[PDB]
Amino acid sequence: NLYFQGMTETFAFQAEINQLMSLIINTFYSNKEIFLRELISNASDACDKIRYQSLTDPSVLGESPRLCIRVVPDKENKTLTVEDNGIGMTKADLVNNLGTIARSGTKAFMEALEAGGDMSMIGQFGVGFYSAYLVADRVTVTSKNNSDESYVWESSAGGTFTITSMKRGTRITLHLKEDQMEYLEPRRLKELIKKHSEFIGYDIELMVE
């Protein structure tokens, strides 16, 4: 009907991913800061993929060819955001790869941790996105791929996530936990970005508010 405004779908996580979310959100791991490197790493991969598409087909860049990553603290909303103009993600991408179908890394990473491995290796296993929950109690991912409309994924690690229906790219917004408000202070962010982005080939912009 003309009067329709929106739709949200709630899905359960695949069991291993649910387990990983619980473990991460509850862990006493003492080096929580690692989340940012992972989010940035993921943006760089997103940007790489659209870049490779552009080599055969320049049109994919649209009217946004300058690829780059931006970090956005928000003291008022108590949220930190990592955004990119990379390839971005379709609904299927979000539903499949960010919830319902787990790759081999979910289990392996949990098995590595059980055998005394370190949380900082999480990226290697293809599940470092989920390190957001070390500092966050809710994560909101808004993305647009050139071949789909934009969508909003959101989860509080409560066993489920929603899918609700912007320019090409992705925004990862973290609702910070009560004790993790240090990741809104700009001096902290500057030193953290510079610590692990020596070899990221895209400019990383720290937006001031």
Ligand X SMILES: CO[C@H]1/C=C\C=C(/C)C(=O)NC2=CC(=O)C(NCCN3CCCC3)=C(C[C@@H](C)C[C@H](OC)[C@H](O)[C@@H](C)/C=C(\C)[C@@H]1OC(N)=O)C2=O
**Which residues of this protein are in contact with ligand X, per CB under 6 A?**
42-43, 45-46, 49, 84, 86-87, 89, 93, 97-98, 126-130, 141, 170, 172
At 49, which amino acid appears? Answer: K
What is the H or E stretch that residue 129 is in? none
Q: Which of ligand X, its own copies, none does 27 bind, CB closer than 5 to 8 A by kind?
A: none
DSSP 3-state of 158: coil
Instruction: Using the minimum distance from each CB to its own copies, give the nearer residue, 102 or 136.
Output: 102
Instruction: Using the minimum distance from each CB to its own copies, give the nearer residue, 92 or 207.
Output: 92
List C-alpha distances in Å: 100 to 11, 14, 95, 128, 161: 8, 5, 6, 16, 10
Q: Which of ligand X, its own copies, none does 93 bind, CB closer than 5 to 8 A by kind?
A: ligand X
Is 145 within any annotated ligand binding site? no
Q: Which of its own copies, ligand X, none does 55 bind, CB closer than 5 to 8 A by kind?
A: none
Instruction: Using the minimum distance from each CB to its own copies, give the nearer residue, 67 or 89.
Output: 89
DSSP of 76-99, one letter per residue? TTTEEEEEE-SS---HHHHHIIII
Residue 5 is a binding residue for its own copies (CB under 8 A): yes
List C-alpha distances in Å: 107 to 20, 27, 56: 8, 17, 37
Q: What CA–CA distance (Å, rounded) separates 69 from 88?
A: 13
Q: What CA–CA distance (Å, rounded) separates 209 from 202?
A: 22
Instruction: Using the minimum distance from each CB to ligand X, give the nearer residue, 54 or 97.
Output: 97
Q: Which of ligand X, its own copies, none does 127 bind, CB closer than 5 to 8 A by kind?
A: ligand X
Positions at the binding site: 38, 42, 84, 89, 97, 104-105, 124-129, 149-150, 170
Residues of the shown chain interacting with its own copies in the complex, contacts defined by CB under 8 A: 1-14, 95, 99-100, 160
